[PDB]
Amino acid sequence: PGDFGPPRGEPIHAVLTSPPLVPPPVNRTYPAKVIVELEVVEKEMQISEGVSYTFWTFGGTVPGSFIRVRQGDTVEFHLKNHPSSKMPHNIDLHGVTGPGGGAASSFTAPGHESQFTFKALNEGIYVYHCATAPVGMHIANGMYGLILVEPPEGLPKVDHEYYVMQGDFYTAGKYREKGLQPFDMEKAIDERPSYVLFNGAEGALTGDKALHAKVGETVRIFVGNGGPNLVSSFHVIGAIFDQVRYEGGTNVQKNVQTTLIPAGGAAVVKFTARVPGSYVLVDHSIFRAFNKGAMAILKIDGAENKLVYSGKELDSVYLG
Amino acid sequence: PGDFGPPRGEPIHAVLTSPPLVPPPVNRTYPAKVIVELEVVEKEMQISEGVSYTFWTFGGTVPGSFIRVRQGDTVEFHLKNHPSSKMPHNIDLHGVTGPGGGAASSFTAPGHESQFTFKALNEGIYVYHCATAPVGMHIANGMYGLILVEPPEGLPKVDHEYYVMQGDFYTAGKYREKGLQPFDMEKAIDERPSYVLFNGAEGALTGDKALHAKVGETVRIFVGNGGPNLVSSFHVIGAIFDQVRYEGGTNVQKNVQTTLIPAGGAAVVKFTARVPGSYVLVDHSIFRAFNKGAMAILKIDGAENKLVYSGKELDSVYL
Amino acid sequence: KLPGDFGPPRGEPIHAVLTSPPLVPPPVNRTYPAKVIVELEVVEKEMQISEGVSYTFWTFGGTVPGSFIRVRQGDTVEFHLKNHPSSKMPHNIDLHGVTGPGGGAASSFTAPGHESQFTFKALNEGIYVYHCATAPVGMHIANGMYGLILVEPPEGLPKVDHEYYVMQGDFYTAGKYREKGLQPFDMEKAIDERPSYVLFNGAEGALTGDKALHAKVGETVRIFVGNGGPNLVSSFHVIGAIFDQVRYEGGTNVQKNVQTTLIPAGGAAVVKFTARVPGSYVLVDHSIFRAFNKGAMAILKIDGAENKLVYSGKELDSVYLG
Ligand SMILES: [Cl-]
Ligand SMILES: [Cl-]
Ligand SMILES: [Cl-]
Ligand SMILES: [Cu+2]
Ligand SMILES: [Cu+2]
Ligand SMILES: [Cu+2]
Ligand SMILES: [Cu+2]
Ligand SMILES: [Cu+2]
Ligand SMILES: [Cu+2]
* A274 touches C: beta carbon within 8 Å: yes
DSSP string, C173-211: BSS-TT--EEEPB-HHHHHTT--SEEEETTSTTTTSGGG
Distance of alpha carbon B106 from alpha carbon C240, whole angstroms: 14
Contact A77, A115 (CB under 8 A): yes
> Is C96 within any annotated ligand binding site?
yes
Residue B115 to residue C315, Cβ atoms within 8 A: yes
Query: Counting every residue, how long is chain B?
Result: 319
Question: Quick one: which of C289, C224, C225, C236 has its CA closest to C261?
Answer: C236
Task: Find which of B91, B94, B130 to mutate to test the C interface (most C CBs within 10 Å of its CB).
Answer: B94
**Which chains contact C through at least 3 pairs of Cβ atoms less than 8 Å apart?**
A, B
Give the β-pairing of B51-58 and B33-48: antiparallel
Distance of alpha carbon A7 from alpha carbon C58, whole angstroms: 62
Nearest 5°: CA angle at C267, between C263 and C269? 55
Give the Å distances, CA to CA, from C279 to A73, B100, B101, B126, C305: 57, 9, 11, 21, 10
Query: Counting every residue, how long is chain C?
Result: 322
Find the B143 Cα to ligand 3 centroid distance in Å.
12
The secondary element (H helix, E strand) that includes residue A216 is none
Contact C30, C75 (CB under 8 A): no
Distance of alpha carbon A6 from alpha carbon A31, whole angstroms: 7
Distance of alpha carbon A260 from alpha carbon B258, whole angstroms: 11
Residue B166 main-chain phi, psi, to 5 deg: -80, 150
**Which chains contact B through at least 3 pairs of Cβ atoms less than 8 Å apart?**
A, C
Contact C104, C92 (CB under 8 A): yes
Distance of alpha carbon A310 from alpha carbon A315, whole angstroms: 13
Q: State the maximum Cα–Cα separation within chain A, in Å, rounded to a whole number.
A: 76
Alpha helix positions (H), A37-164 = 135-140
What is the DSSP-derived secondary structure letter of residue B136? Answer: H
SS3 state of residue A190: helix
- The one-letter amino acid code at B234 reads F
* C-alpha torsion C260→C261→C266→C272, nearest 10: -100
Residues 6+ apart with CB under 8 A from A170: A140, A183, A184, A185, A187, A188, A192, A193, A194
SS3 state of residue B223: strand
Is the preceding omega at residue C65 within 30 degrees of 0, hence cis? yes
Nearest 5°: CA angle at C228, between C222 and C233? 85
Contact B81, B92 (CB under 8 A): no
Question: Quick one: which of A81, C47, C8 has its CA closest to B317?
Answer: A81
Cα B140 from chain centroid (whole Å): 14
Smallest CA–CA distance, residue B24 to chain C, in Å, is 22
Cα B38 from chain centroid (whole Å): 16
Give this entry's resolution in angstroms: 2.2
Contact B115, B149 (CB under 8 A): no
Q: State the maximum Cα–Cα separation within chain B, in Å, rounded to a whole number.
A: 76
Residue B118 to residue C256, Cβ atoms within 8 A: no
SS3 state of residue C35: strand
Contact B129, B67 (CB under 8 A): no
- The one-letter amino acid code at C147 reads G
The secondary element (H helix, E strand) that includes residue C189 is helix C187-191
Nearest 5°: CA angle at B142, between B139 and B143? 60
Residue A238 to residue C100, Cβ atoms within 8 A: yes
SS3 state of residue C27: coil
Contact A151, A233 (CB under 8 A): no
Question: Quick one: which of A244, A221, A245, A223 has its CA closest to A232?
Answer: A223
Cα C83 from chain centroid (whole Å): 21
**What is B156-319's CATH topology?**
Immunoglobulin-like (2.60.40)
Distance of alpha carbon C247 from alpha carbon C270, whole angstroms: 5
Task: Find which of C259, C261, C300 to mutate to test the B interface (most B CBs within 10 Å of its CB).
Answer: C259
Give the β-pairing of A218-227 and A265-272: antiparallel
> Which bin fits B92, alpha (ψ -120 to 50), beta or left (φ > 0)?
beta
User: CB-CB: which of C98, C137, C249 is closest to A286?
Assistant: C137
* B177 touches C: beta carbon within 8 Å: no
* B63 touches C: beta carbon within 8 Å: no
**Which chains contact A through at least 3 pairs of Cβ atoms less than 8 Å apart?**
B, C
From the number of C-beta atoms within 10 Å of its C-beta (0-12, 13-18, 19+), residue A88 rates as middle
SS (H, E, C) C117-135: EEEEECCCCEEEEEECCCC
Percent helix, strand, coil in chain B (nearest 5)?
A: 10, 45, 45
Give the Å distances, CA to CA, from C187 to A122, A229, C2, C134: 45, 22, 42, 15
* Residues of chain C contacting B228 with CB distance shorter than 8 Å: 287-289
* Residues of chain B contacting A82 with CB distance shorter than 8 Å: 318
Q: Within a 13 Å sphere around the CA of A13, how many CA atoms are in the beta-carbon half?
A: 1
CB atoms within 10 A of CB B143: 29
SS3 state of residue B107: coil
In sequence order, the β-bridge partners of residue A176 are: none
Instruction: List the domain boundaries for chain A.
Output: 1-151, 156-320
The secondary element (H helix, E strand) that includes residue C215 is strand C213-216
Contact C171, C55 (CB under 8 A): yes
Q: In what order do the strands lie in the sheet with A265-272?
A: A195-198, A160-169, A218-227, A265-272, A241-245, A253-256
CB atoms within 10 A of CB C15: 10
Nearest 5°: CA angle at B240, between A162 and A226? 45
SS3 state of residue C140: helix
Residue B96 to residue C239, Cβ atoms within 8 A: no
Distance of alpha carbon C50 from alpha carbon C53, whole angstroms: 5
Distance of alpha carbon C83 from alpha carbon C62, whole angstroms: 11
In sequence order, the β-bridge partners of residue B88 are: none
In sequence order, the β-bridge partners of residue A55 are: A43
Task: Find which of C6, C131, C253, C255 to mutate to test the A interface (most A CBs within 10 Å of its CB).
Answer: C253
Which residues of A are known binding-site members for Cu(2+)? Answer: 89, 92, 94, 129-130, 138, 143, 284
Contact B234, B284 (CB under 8 A): yes
Cα B237 from chain centroid (whole Å): 19
Contact C83, C40 (CB under 8 A): no
CB atoms within 10 A of CB A50: 10
End-to-end CA distance of chain A: 66
Residues 6+ apart with CB under 8 A from C3: C73
Rg (CA), chain C: 20
Residue A249 main-chain phi, psi, to 5 deg: -70, 180
Give the β-pairing of B67-70 and B195-198: unpaired
* C-alpha torsion C33→C34→C35→C41, nearest 10: -110
Contact C114, A316 (CB under 8 A): yes
Contact A267, A221 (CB under 8 A): no
End-to-end CA distance of chain B: 68
Residue A105 to residue B192, Cβ atoms within 8 A: no
Contact C278, C303 (CB under 8 A): yes
Task: Find which of A196, A240, A316 to mutate to test the C interface (most C CBs within 10 Å of its CB).
Answer: A240
> Is B94 within any annotated ligand binding site?
yes
Give the Å distances, CA to CA, from C176 to A30, B169, B219, C194, C289: 63, 23, 47, 11, 15
Give the Å distances, CA to CA, from C171 to A67, C92, C164, C279, C293: 42, 20, 22, 30, 13
Question: Quick one: which of B69, B272, B52 has its CA closest to B159?
Answer: B272
Contact C155, C73 (CB under 8 A): no
User: CB-CB: which of C246, C279, C288 is closest to B98?
Assistant: C279
> Is C145 within any annotated ligand binding site?
yes
Residue B96 to residue C294, Cβ atoms within 8 A: no
Contact B212, B251 (CB under 8 A): no
Give the Å distances, CA to CA, from C90 to C65, C67, C183: 19, 19, 22
Distance of alpha carbon C169 from alpha carbon C59, whole angstroms: 13
CATH of segment(s) A156-320: 2.60.40.420
End-to-end CA distance of chain C: 69
Distance of alpha carbon A94 from alpha carbon B235, whole angstroms: 9
What is the DSSP-derived secondary structure letter of residue A49? Answer: T
SS3 state of residue B287: helix
Distance of alpha carbon C124 from alpha carbon C122, whole angstroms: 6
CATH of segment(s) C1-153: 2.60.40.420
SS3 state of residue C212: coil
> Which bin fits C218, alpha (ψ -120 to 50), beta or left (φ > 0)?
left
Question: Quick one: which of B46, B51, B42 has its CA closest to B173?
Answer: B51
Nearest 5°: CA angle at B68, between B62 and B73? 140
Find the C48 Cα to ligand 2 centroid distance in Å.
47
In sequence order, the β-bridge partners of residue A66 are: A17
Distance of alpha carbon A162 from alpha carbon A267, whole angstroms: 12
Is the preceding omega at residue A228 within 30 degrees of 0, hence cis? yes
Contact B70, B27 (CB under 8 A): no
C1-153 and C158-322 have identical folds:
yes
Distance of alpha carbon C239 from alpha carbon C237, whole angstroms: 6
Residue A288 to residue C231, Cβ atoms within 8 A: yes
Distance of alpha carbon C321 from alpha carbon B81, whole angstroms: 9
Residue A133 main-chain phi, psi, to 5 deg: -60, 135
Residue A306 to residue C119, Cβ atoms within 8 A: yes
Smallest-distance ligand from the CA of B108:
6
Rg (CA), chain B: 20
* A235 touches C: beta carbon within 8 Å: yes
Smallest CA–CA distance, residue A258 to chain C, in Å, is 5
Residue C101 to residue A239, Cβ atoms within 8 A: no
* B303 touches A: beta carbon within 8 Å: no
* Residues of chain C contacting A306 with CB distance shorter than 8 Å: 119
Question: Quick one: which of C66, C75, C5 has its CA closest to C39?
Answer: C66
User: CB-CB: which of A80, A81, A188 is closest to B287?
Assistant: A188
Question: What residue in A sits closest to C85 (Cα-Cα)?
Answer: A319
> Is B92 within any annotated ligand binding site?
yes
> Which bin fits C14, alpha (ψ -120 to 50), beta or left (φ > 0)?
beta
The secondary element (H helix, E strand) that includes residue C139 is helix C137-142
Question: Quick one: which of C85, B111, C227, B311 has its CA closest to A258?
Answer: C227
Sign of the four-CA dihedral B25, B27, B29, B33: negative
Residue B314 to residue A114, Cβ atoms within 8 A: yes
* B253 touches C: beta carbon within 8 Å: no
Residue C70 main-chain phi, psi, to 5 deg: -125, 110
Nearest 5°: CA angle at B211, between B210 and B215? 125
Residue C266 to residue A277, Cβ atoms within 8 A: no
Distance of alpha carbon C143 from alpha carbon C132, whole angstroms: 10
Tell me: domain C158-322, CATH 1.10.8.80, correct?
Answer: no
Give the β-pairing of A241-245 and A253-256: antiparallel
CATH of segment(s) B1-151: 2.60.40.420
Contact C297, C290 (CB under 8 A): no
Cβ-count burial C218-255 (b if 16+ within 10 Å, e if not): ebbbbbbbbbbbbbbbbbbbbbbbbbbbbbbbbbebbb
* Residues of chain B contacting C280 with CB distance shorter than 8 Å: 99
Task: Find which of B34, B97, B168 to mutate to test the C interface (most C CBs within 10 Å of its CB).
Answer: B97
Contact B63, B205 (CB under 8 A): no
Give the β-pairing of C146-152 and C126-131: antiparallel
Distance of alpha carbon B281 from alpha carbon B219, whole angstroms: 13
Residues 6+ apart with CB under 8 A from B10: none
Question: Quick one: which of C199, C197, A230 has its CA closest to B189?
Answer: C197
The secondary element (H helix, E strand) that includes residue A289 is helix A287-291
Question: What residue in C sits closest to B85 (Cα-Cα)?
Answer: C322
Rg (CA), chain A: 20
Smallest-distance ligand from the CA of B64:
6
User: CB-CB: which of C280, C281, C293 is closest to B189?
Assistant: C293
